[PDB]
Design an enzyme around this catalytic site. Structure first.
Site, PDB file in Angstrom:
ATOM      1  CG  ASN B  11      -1.842   0.860   1.339  1.00 49.52           C
ATOM      2  OD1 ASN B  11      -2.455   1.647   0.552  1.00 49.52           O
ATOM      3  ND2 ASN B  11      -2.240   1.075   2.544  1.00 49.52           N
ATOM      4  CE  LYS B  13      -0.662   2.867   4.846  1.00 52.34           C
ATOM      5  NZ  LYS B  13      -0.441   3.167   6.371  1.00 52.34           N
ATOM      6  CG  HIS B  95      -6.542   0.755   4.720  1.00 52.78           C
ATOM      7  ND1 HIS B  95      -5.952   1.735   5.362  1.00 52.78           N
ATOM      8  CD2 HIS B  95      -5.276  -0.183   4.550  1.00 52.78           C
ATOM      9  CE1 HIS B  95      -4.738   1.340   5.523  1.00 52.78           C
ATOM     10  NE2 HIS B  95      -4.489   0.311   4.971  1.00 52.78           N
ATOM     11  CD  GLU B  97      -3.677   4.913   6.551  1.00 52.02           C
ATOM     12  OE1 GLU B  97      -3.701   4.820   5.403  1.00 52.02           O
ATOM     13  OE2 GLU B  97      -2.902   4.553   7.437  1.00 52.02           O
ATOM     14  CD  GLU B 165      -6.030  -1.907   8.282  1.00 49.50           C
ATOM     15  OE1 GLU B 165      -7.166  -1.400   8.388  1.00 49.50           O
ATOM     16  OE2 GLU B 165      -5.018  -1.318   7.424  1.00 49.50           O
ATOM     17  N   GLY B 171       0.345   3.254  15.703  1.00 49.39           N
ATOM     18  CA  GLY B 171       0.383   4.407  16.324  1.00 49.39           C
ATOM     19  C   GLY B 171       0.531   4.271  17.934  1.00 49.39           C
ATOM     20  CB  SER B 211       4.841  -3.099  11.913  1.00 44.89           C
ATOM     21  OG  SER B 211       6.252  -2.228  12.010  1.00 44.89           O
TER      22      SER B 211
END
Lengths: 248, 248
Positions: B11, B13, B95, B97, B165, B171, B211
């Site tokens: 991805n 982004k 996704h 986000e 995910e 984060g 990650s």
């Protein structure tokens, strides 16, 4: 500069493939564009580059929305720098679908305006009331609240255009009739005088967004404060040509 | 035991312009994928054409998001057809986000899973519980809820891969061990059986979207039900080639 150069931008929304697009690009690349006019075209975002390759240098390519930072983790977004890198010199921001179908807040549209402008793409920031507001007659507040916020993040008015879109006029021949258009265009060029500067008011293009058709286009461009048009679905039909040849 | 082809998509982004991206496409093309594996790249919407034009077809292009209709007054949007017209064959949908930064609702993602799939595009559909819900014990609920509504829109599960995910770990400050990534690849597989079919569970890839770097990729591709990766930022680098070869 001297007198407000006429502006007709056409937003193709999520319509079209490369074949229909390619052919429309042929109609436009062969319609007579008056130097009267400055024409910009928003293609759907998968085709900003296609479109820029194909279109005549005299029709500016515009992206339909962009994000607040130059690069980041935000899947589905595009940034100004990528709009510039593809060759499109404008972005359409605050358009009603963003705001009322996808929930873009004024603080997002602020943040976008400001960032876009930092990059040197021109914005068409969009503002406009729904029916519940025209009903309450609080048009004044909701066009003015909206313009405070775009205006607070504009730092150099040269590059920005304001497009009055009364939400109800999107998608039906339910237009603001020429006086309807001009009550609110005038009231808003006046707000920019109160609040920004006479030179901004004097030189800022306020274009009309709503259902411009090949019919409606000349009566509308005869109002003193209607500076050109944001054309939705008519820009996809060949009568668009006529809307470029509107106020003379 | 399966003939589950290893999937590993990148991805990009909202990252990149045509110099850099072209440079990565370059690396990516002189690289060699295994025969067991399937690489997909996810360009910023603006470059899905540019990217498909430069990339080797042994790598598939993918869009990072699409809308639930073919064409419409959805300024900002692109449709499965627009993607497929660019030569791209996958959409990354649901996704995090979008679901968290951009308010994409579960009903609305499922309406795009049904529709992207109606257009013959494949779909990497994303699910994951945020930190709060990892901690509240609730992982289950959220992840099941989420798969559920993707599942209520999938007619043919050969056209889809599921991506976990661990949104609670990115984060946040907390971290997913390959072992704890695997236990939800086990739950989701066990959901597919109990809720849809075992004919799906032994067949659908369930790919991890945490990650994954050049270092971690081997320790995570080893886990039973980890069929690949939806790689973030490691993917904008030649490290992606090491992730692709994580099963060699």
């Amino acid at each position: 500069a001297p007198s407000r150069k006429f502006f007709v931008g056409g937003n193709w929304k999520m319509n079209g493939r490369k074949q229909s697009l390619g052919e429309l690009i042929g109609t436009l690349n062969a319609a007579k564009v008056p130097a009267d006019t400055e024409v910009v075209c928003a293609p759907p975002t998968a085709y900003i580059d296609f479109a820029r390759q194909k279109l005549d240098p005299k029709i500016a390519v515009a992206a339909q929305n962009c994000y607040k930072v130059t690069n980041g983790a935000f899947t589905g977004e595009i940034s100004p720098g990528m709009i510039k890198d593809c060759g499109a010199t404008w972005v359409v921001l605050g358009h009603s679908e963003r705001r009322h179908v996808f929930g873009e807040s004024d603080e997002l549209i602020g943040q976008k305006v400001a960032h876009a402008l930092a990059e040197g793409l021109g914005v068409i920031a969009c503002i406009g009331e729904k029916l519940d507001e025209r009903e309450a007659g609080i048009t004044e507040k909701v066009v003015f609240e909206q313009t405070k916020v775009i205006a607070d993040n504009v730092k150099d008015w040269s590059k920005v255009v304001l497009a009055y879109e009364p939400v109800w006029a999107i998608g039906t021949g339910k237009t603001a009739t020429p006086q309807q258009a001009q009550e609110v265009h005038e009231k808003l060029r006046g707000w920019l005088k109160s609040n920004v500067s006479d030179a901004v008011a004097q030189s800022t293009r306020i274009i009309y967004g709503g259902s411009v058709t090949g019919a409606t286009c000349k009566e509308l461009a005869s109002q003193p404060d209607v500076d050109g048009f944001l054309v939705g679905g008519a820009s996809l039909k060949p009568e668009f040509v006529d809307i470029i040849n509107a106020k003379q």
